[PDB]
Symmetry: C3
Subunit: 128 residues, 3 copies
């Protein structure tokens, strides 16, 4: 591959932001919003990222929560499992744990992508 | 092993469903319920899967949320860490984020199993 | 490395507990509290662990929920992503899903650390 076994990103909207790690030791690639939305108090919402992704073979893309938002605004990430064979747009489902709404302006880093190494064997069913 | 390093599944109840990936690129193996239960609004519940599993060495089984259920019914997965040395029955703890109960009929895919590769070294305690 | 590619732990407070797996097949290293705190009903809180950690290269440290606490007290773990380049103190953000507060005495195992293998390639942006 030379290195086509990396994170293939395709911006769908011009407004989109290329995912990027914020440190040499960072685990995930920052993931920003492409729209202005409000995560309802005690409610959820799916934020468009405006990008599609192709995870490296042997891994899946887990949308994990950013420490900041979790801490300060009790924001959590629901679902978050992006299959290697997913060609659609990455949507980020946020859940407001707090009693007060949460504002999201375009461009904001609303989550982070982690390329988690998984194993995808077959199922050996044990009879007796 | 030839391939005994795959997902060993043992149905405990005849009603059980063998976990299975739904795509070539899917990350997890579908996980169905073996009973009819209701996930209480704003409450949780542990759904029996009726199966026991033996994860491949070098990984653990993370019970992750299905995108659909998360999106449409604000259903989330609590706990979800199945150790390689777990011989009991896989129980799936679902949490209803919504204001309205959620019905689960036997056979339904209530979560997905992901064989996540972990490293299990020893702890090197740094003194001074 | 010989084996300096293991979980490097540095107790910050004498009161701290060295993370440790509770089984040969356990996926995570137990993580205890270093203080007496209360996880507010329907609220969150960041529990100090009194330790700093250096994850092995090629992985990140995911703070996962303990099955017990999740089941019995509807306790969940928010955020939970500790980067390999994190030199600060591991803080554990717990979220009380239940209607009743949750007490945490010093020494208690409040979560578990899982050294999850990730891949950290570069981003190949697909133009046209
Ligand atoms: O539950 C958690 C989650 C994260 N961290 C630490 C690990 C990581 O190295 C650091 C990340 O801070 P940040 O990512 O630089 O700020 P942000 O999450 O807003 O990007 O916080 C914790 O101690 N506990
Ligand atoms: O937060 C999420 C979770 C999943 N997906 C995408 C990735 C995956 O490829 C697809 C999965 O749809 P599905 O699994 O086929 O439907 P279901 O989750 O009900 O099995 O949804 C997102 O965009 N955002
Ligand atoms: O959603 C879950 C989470 C865990 N387990 C199983 C897998 C694991 O092998 C066992 C762990 O029990 P424990 O870790 O020994 O008790 P505790 O979580 O309090 O440490 O529970 C489940 O069946 N379902
Ligand atoms: Mg939650």
């Amino acid at each position: 591959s030379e290195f086509m076994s990396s994170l293939l990103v395709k911006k769908l909207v011009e407004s989109a932001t290329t995912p990027m790690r914020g440190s040499e030791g960072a685990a995930g690639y920052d993931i920003s919003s492409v729209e202005d939305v409000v995560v309802p108090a005690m409610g959820r919402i799916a934020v468009s990222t405006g990008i599609s992704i192709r995870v490296p073979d042997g891994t899946y893309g887990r949308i994990a929560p950013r420490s900041g938002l979790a801490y300060k605004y009790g924001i959590d990430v629901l679902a978050g499992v992006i299959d290697e064979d997913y060609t659609g747009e990455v949507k980020v489902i946020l859940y407001n744990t707090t009693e007060r709404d949460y504002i999201i302006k375009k461009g904001d880093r609303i989550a982070q992508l982690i390329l988690e190494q998984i194993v995808t064997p077959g199922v050996a069913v044990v009879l007796d």
